[PDB]
Structure formats: C-alpha cells, structure tokens
Design an enzyme around this catalytic site. Structure first.
Site, mmCIF file in Angstrom:
data_model
loop_
_atom_site.group_PDB
_atom_site.id
_atom_site.type_symbol
_atom_site.label_atom_id
_atom_site.label_comp_id
_atom_site.label_asym_id
_atom_site.label_seq_id
_atom_site.Cartn_x
_atom_site.Cartn_y
_atom_site.Cartn_z
ATOM 1 N N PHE A 22 -0.690 6.387 -2.203
ATOM 2 C CA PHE A 22 -1.142 6.448 -3.597
ATOM 3 C C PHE A 22 -1.895 5.180 -4.010
ATOM 4 O O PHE A 22 -1.836 4.767 -5.168
ATOM 5 C CB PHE A 22 0.057 6.644 -4.538
ATOM 6 C CG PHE A 22 1.134 5.582 -4.400
ATOM 7 C CD1 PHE A 22 2.239 5.591 -5.244
ATOM 8 C CD2 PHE A 22 1.060 4.595 -3.416
ATOM 9 C CE1 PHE A 22 3.255 4.638 -5.108
ATOM 10 C CE2 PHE A 22 2.069 3.640 -3.273
ATOM 11 C CZ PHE A 22 3.168 3.662 -4.121
ATOM 12 N N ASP A 67 11.652 8.184 -8.310
ATOM 13 C CA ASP A 67 11.550 7.303 -7.157
ATOM 14 C C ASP A 67 12.208 5.940 -7.381
ATOM 15 O O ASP A 67 11.623 4.894 -7.115
ATOM 16 C CB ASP A 67 10.088 7.143 -6.740
ATOM 17 C CG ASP A 67 9.941 6.575 -5.334
ATOM 18 O OD1 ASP A 67 10.590 7.101 -4.393
ATOM 19 O OD2 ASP A 67 9.170 5.604 -5.170
ATOM 20 N N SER A 114 0.821 -1.203 0.000
ATOM 21 C CA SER A 114 0.000 0.000 0.000
ATOM 22 C C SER A 114 0.859 1.258 0.000
ATOM 23 O O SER A 114 1.891 1.318 -0.673
ATOM 24 C CB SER A 114 -0.929 0.002 1.222
ATOM 25 O OG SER A 114 -0.205 -0.216 2.421
#
Length: 264
Positions: free
Chosen positions: A21, A129, A18
């Site tokens: 987002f 990221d 999770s």
C-alpha cells in the site's frame, strides 16, 4: 478546511519502510514528518481508492493517542503526511531490542492504547490492523496508534486476527470485537513479552488451527507480577466467541480501576 498541502512543499528523504500500500519516507514539511507515498507513475483506479479512503478516515481523527494526520498531497504524487514518531514500535521494544518496562509502564501502554481505540470506535471507525507494529512509543512515553490503510467507517500479520476473521466466515467478519481481539494479542505480548505461537513455525497451520479453534494463545506464561485483574481481562478480550469480548469503553474502565489499587 482542505488539508491539501500546497503543491511542491513536501520533500521526502530517507526510506523507512514499505509494503503493498505504498512506501514510507521521512520527509520535511514544517519540521520532520513521515510521508507515505505511491511512486507508481500513474495511480490506478482501485489504488486511488486506497488513498481517498484512508485520507478520509484520518481526517476524522484528532486525538492524542492517534498518529496525528497533517495533510495529503496529490500533484507531485499521491502522498499522506503524518507527524514523525520520535521513538519505536511497541513491537521493536518488546521483540527486537527486548526493552524491559516496569509493570507500570506496561499497564500504562495498555491504558493509552485502549484510550485511543475507544476514541476511534466512538467516531465509529474500525482499525482492522492493530498490531504491536502500528503502536509507536513516541518520546518513549506516548502511545500513538497508526497505519490506517485498512481502516473503515461502517498483509501476512495473522497473529492479531480474531478467529472469525481468519476463517473469513461470510464477508463482514471485521467489527469492534475483532479489534478487541487484536487488542487482546497485544496485552498478551505486553504481559508475556513474547509473540504468540512462537513454538510453531508454519503459517498455514497457525492460520488454520486458530480459525478452526484448535490452537490458542498460551495464557499460563504471563509475568508473575501481572495483576490478576489484568490476566483475567486479557482472556476476556481473546474469547474465541466474538460476542463475548468486552467493547473498549468497558476495557478502558477495567484497565483503570485495576490501575489504582496497584500498589507499590
């Protein structure tokens, strides 16, 4: 055209992870797939953007080292269906179960990751990221870059943020060079087997010092069997000064010329 999965064909099962987002599930749509959803009954305005954007970036990618995007869904609920990685994150291998790859399987994981990152950049995409957590080792012999939530086309994971980004200089710190820095922190953990600043236990301090320039990844701890050509490249990708890090094309060529004359 249209990767809008006909309605009611997807079926989610187990809950993988999770964040903020959306939550990831392991569904089934013509085989095993990883489905990323947004359960909040009514999609807010700003969120519908996190969606449209990602999906918009994913559909521009069709490369063996990028997690294959298969389709998106809206009707039941906002969802993004991607192939199911049959393995584990480079992170999990290195830091949780401490897998020990040869120095060839490593110089390779490096080669592959840089191969895909080179691809995304050509298509003019910036990841924003890259972490050893978004790099999955598919079938234990295939690098799949993933997690394009923050990807653009121009999150307490600060261990991979270039300094110019942590210092949130102006308002567009991110750049190919910022990604080259995060690629840097990964070559690091590939070669050292550890995460950076493991000896400091304060985020605020690490965040601060790293952007301020006081702190920096200990290079004196890379394996004995790590090619000098590599250690040298690693430091170049970590350069505190944005405009001196090589871009991927160069990185790719290096990891390759230093790959032949190994030897055995």
């Amino acid at each position: 055209d249209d990767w809008e999965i006909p309605d009611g064909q997807i079926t989610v099962g187990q809950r993988i992870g999770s964040g903020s987002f959306g939550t990831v599930y392991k569904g089934k749509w013509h085989g095993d797939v990883a489905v990323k959803m947004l359960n909040v009954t009514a999609p807010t305005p700003q969120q519908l953007q996190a969606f449209k954007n990602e999906v918009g970036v994913l559909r521009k990618t069709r490369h063996v080292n990028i997690l294959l995007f298969m389709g998106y869904s809206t009707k039941p609920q906002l969802a993004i269906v991607t192939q199911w990685c049959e393995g584990s994150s480079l992170y999990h291998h290195l830091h949780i179960i401490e897998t020990k790859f040869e120095m060839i399987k490593l110089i390779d994981i490096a080669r592959q990751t840089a191969q895909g990152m080179d691809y995304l950049h050509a298509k003019s995409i910036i990841h924003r990221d890259l972490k050893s957590n978004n790099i999955f080792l598919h079938e234990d012999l295939t690098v799949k870059i993933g997690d394009f939530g923050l990807a653009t086309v121009k999150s307490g994971s600060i261990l991979w943020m270039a300094p110019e980004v942590i210092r949130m200089q102006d308002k567009n710190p991110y750049s190919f060079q910022s990604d080259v820095y995060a690629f840097g922190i990964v070559l690091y953990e590939l070669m050292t087997g550890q995460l950076p600043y493991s000896n400091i236990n304060n985020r605020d301090q690490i965040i601060f010092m790293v952007g301020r320039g006081y702190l920096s990844p200990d290079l004196s701890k890379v394996r004995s069997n790590c090619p000098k050509a590599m250690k040298r490249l690693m430091a170049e990708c970590l350069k505190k000064k944005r405009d001196e890090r090589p871009l991927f094309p160069q990185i790719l060529a290096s990891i390759e010329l230093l790959a032949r004359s190994l030897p055995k």
